[PDB]
């Protein structure tokens, strides 16, 4: 059977090739630099947020761009004060060493989990005083490595079990999981509309899926290998994508093929993440040579560069308008860009 | 106006005090690392000294994404026991990693008896500081001491001179009398003493 | 779409010789080392041989060095494996793999399971 089955997936390969080819009519870099630049645009360090014991590994924005919570890799996890650089909780948590925190979008729950293999819920109504565990998501055979609300029911996790799901929080189990993936899925992205959301394997295939029917949609590929961060559209019906391949490529949804890809020569460190801003022209990436770079979606050009740490960027993200970017690295500093 | 500001200025440093109340007592925990729910922690204190050693065993083969996580650990544990081969090949990898160059690794041993896919050992040279009282007969002689060769071969052919490696013999009491000249490194190399 | 397609192989008598090939196709050779894999039947993944993407330090495993070589091609992105004395032990299916993390020195466990950077691969019997 696989004599002719892996020769059929091969000649189905083919038929993506000539469907691929035959949408490429034109290109998408003259209708990009026929245009005008818009140049440097000045970025400065409004605040520092320091008190952390070790570094942080990843960040997630508020409800209202108010706060933002920060994930330590000791175990400590810190919600901030945007404007004033407060402390609100410093929840402790029952292992160390995370790698994922989602802030939900109604300001009720907190999520985060690590190599622990259990994704645990926090809620935000302060009845003891302080912050208390509420549900264990626990279930899966590998590390989790990113989660997302949706709402104050459901929530997506990426885990290392090469196999996403979807949660419910009424009872904690895997209603709905899906499967296709070669390798540990690292990174998730959820549309603003909460109606679709795209996930990445170890493989450098973007595979787009159903947040209502366990079924895969799409599939994206082009990116040398090891996709590390993905991020949507503001409206969602792009998304740009980030990895160890240096350079960092936009796909769209409707046509089904790259359009542009961000490369530069003096550049040989790998992308960490990537985030949109609120128009979508600029591309903002963390690199690993200790500096950040914002990318012109509009332009494949370096438009501005931001200097300030000396270690790997290992997360990013804006406000929910595009009013200030926070950007986090293994500094154990959370500097806003702004 | 000062109603609000006072009270949120009250909870900031009630809880900045509280991350100076086990800054001290994390910094006293020098986390370990073990290599071959979903992972293992034991705890430990050897003269008033605290060690959290971790096993992630339970997760999943594939450590291209989580051994990034541990560059924070102090010391990195590592034992053996034709997976000699593919033991001594993840060696050299972690040993040339771009982000692992503060974490020194410790090289254990393991009961044993593997002569027939290195038969380059063969004109092997005698060890030059042998034990023998337990009664080493020459196979094991050469054999454990070729090995021990091979590993201190690759962390002297590459490397910035950051960290180092350090075998035993066959516990506890061995690793702490160990560890202490990790710190010893550390403190010493801050101060540019060569 | 990144896909390693292998050639050569066969039944040929013991003690002959060969020549592995291994075509990359869909990534740039050029900022990637490459590795050999071989799987006796019922065993395991095991690494036999390397190179480096300077097209130097090459190395090899005690039960293939002397009799195993390998080359590569800038010019062309392709790789061949050329042995001799083949020994009833060599009996085994090989793959040709590749790790990811171009210009660097440093990748882990390229024989794990479930490994998508790896060709359909070759046997050969004695």
């Known amino acids: 059977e696989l004599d002719q089955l892996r020769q059929e997936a091969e000649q189905l390969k083919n038929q993506i090739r000539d469907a691929r080819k035959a949408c490429a009519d034109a290109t998408l870099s003259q209708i990009t630099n026929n245009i005008d630049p818009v140049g440097r645009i000045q970025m400065r360090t409004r605040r520092t947020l320091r008190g952390h014991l070790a570094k942080i590994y990843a960040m997630h924005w508020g409800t209202d761009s108010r706060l933002l919570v920060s994930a330590s890799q000791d175990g400590k996890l810190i919600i901030w004060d945007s404007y004033t650089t407060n402390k609100v909780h410093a929840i402790p948590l029952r292992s160390s060493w995370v790698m994922t925190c989602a802030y939900a979008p109604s300001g009720n729950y907190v999520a985060c989990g690590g190599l622990d293999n259990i994704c645990s819920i926090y809620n935000l109504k302060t009845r003891e005083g302080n912050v208390r565990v509420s549900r264990e998501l626990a279930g899966h055979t590998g590390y989790l490595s990113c989660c997302r609300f949706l709402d104050d029911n459901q929530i997506v996790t990426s885990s290392g079990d090469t196999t996403c799901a979807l949660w419910d929080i009424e009872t904690g189990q895997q209603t709905t999981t899906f499967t296709g993936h070669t390798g540990d899925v690292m990174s998730l992205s959820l549309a603003p509309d909460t109606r679709l959301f795209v996930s990445g394997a170890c493989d450098a295939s973007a595979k787009l899926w159903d947040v209502r029917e366990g079924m895969c949609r799409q599939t994206f590929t082009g990116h040398e290998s090891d996709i590390n961060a993905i991020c949507f559209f503001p409206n969602g019906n792009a998304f740009a994508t980030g990895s160890d391949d240096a350079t960092c490529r936009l796909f769209d949804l409707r046509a089904d093929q790259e359009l542009m890809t961000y490369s530069h020569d003096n550049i040989i460190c790998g992308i960490t993440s990537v985030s949109f801003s609120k128009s979508g022209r600029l591309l903002l990436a963390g690199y690993d040579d200790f500096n950040c770079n914002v990318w012109d979606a509009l332009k494949a050009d370096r438009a501005g560069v931001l200097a300030g740490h000396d270690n790997r960027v290992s997360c990013l993200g804006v406000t929910d308008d595009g009013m200030a970017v926070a950007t986090g690295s293994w500094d154990s500093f959370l500097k806003i860009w702004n | 106006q000062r109603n609000e500001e006072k009270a949120q200025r009250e909870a900031n440093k009630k809880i900045e005090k509280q991350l100076q109340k086990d800054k001290q007592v994390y910094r006293a925990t020098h986390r370990l690392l073990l290599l071959g729910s979903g992972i293992f922690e034991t705890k430990f204190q050897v003269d008033k000294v605290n060690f959290h050693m971790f096993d992630v065993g339970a997760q999943r083969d594939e450590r291209r994404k989580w051994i990034q996580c541990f560059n924070d650990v102090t010391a990195i544990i590592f034992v053996v026991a034709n997976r000699l081969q593919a033991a001594l090949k993840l060696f050299d990898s972690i040993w040339n990693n771009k982000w692992l160059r503060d974490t020194s690794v410790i090289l254990f041993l393991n009961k044993q008896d593997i002569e027939d896919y290195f038969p380059e050992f063969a004109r092997y040279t005698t060890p030059e500081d042998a034990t023998p009282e337990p009664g080493e007969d020459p196979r094991v002689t050469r054999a454990k001491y070729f090995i021990r060769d091979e590993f201190l071969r690759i962390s002297t052919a590459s490397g910035d001179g950051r960290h180092y490696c350090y075998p035993h013999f066959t516990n506890i009491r061995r690793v702490f009398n160990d560890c202490r000249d990790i710190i010893q490194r550390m403190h010493l190399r801050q101060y540019e003493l060569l | 779409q990144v896909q390693l397609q292998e050639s050569g192989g066969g039944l040929v008598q013991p003690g002959g010789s060969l020549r592995l090939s291994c075509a990359a196709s869909?990534?740039?050779?050029?900022?990637?080392?490459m590795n050999w894999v071989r799987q006796a039947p019922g065993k395991g993944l095991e690494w036999v041989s390397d190179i480096s993407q300077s097209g130097a330090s090459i190395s090899y495993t005690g039960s293939v060095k002397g009799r195993f070589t390998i080359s590569r091609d800038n010019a062309k992105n392709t790789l061949y494996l050329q042995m001799n004395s083949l020994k009833p032990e060599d009996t085994a299916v090989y793959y040709c793999?590749?790790?990811?993390?171009?210009?660097?020195?440093?990748?882990?466990?390229?024989?794990?399971?479930?490994?998508?950077?790896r060709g359909q691969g070759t046997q050969v019997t004695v």
């Open positions: 869909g990534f740039t050779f050029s900022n990637y080392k």
């Open positions: 793999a590749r790790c990811p993390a171009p210009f660097t020195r440093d990748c882990f466990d390229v024989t794990s399971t479930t490994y998508a950077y």
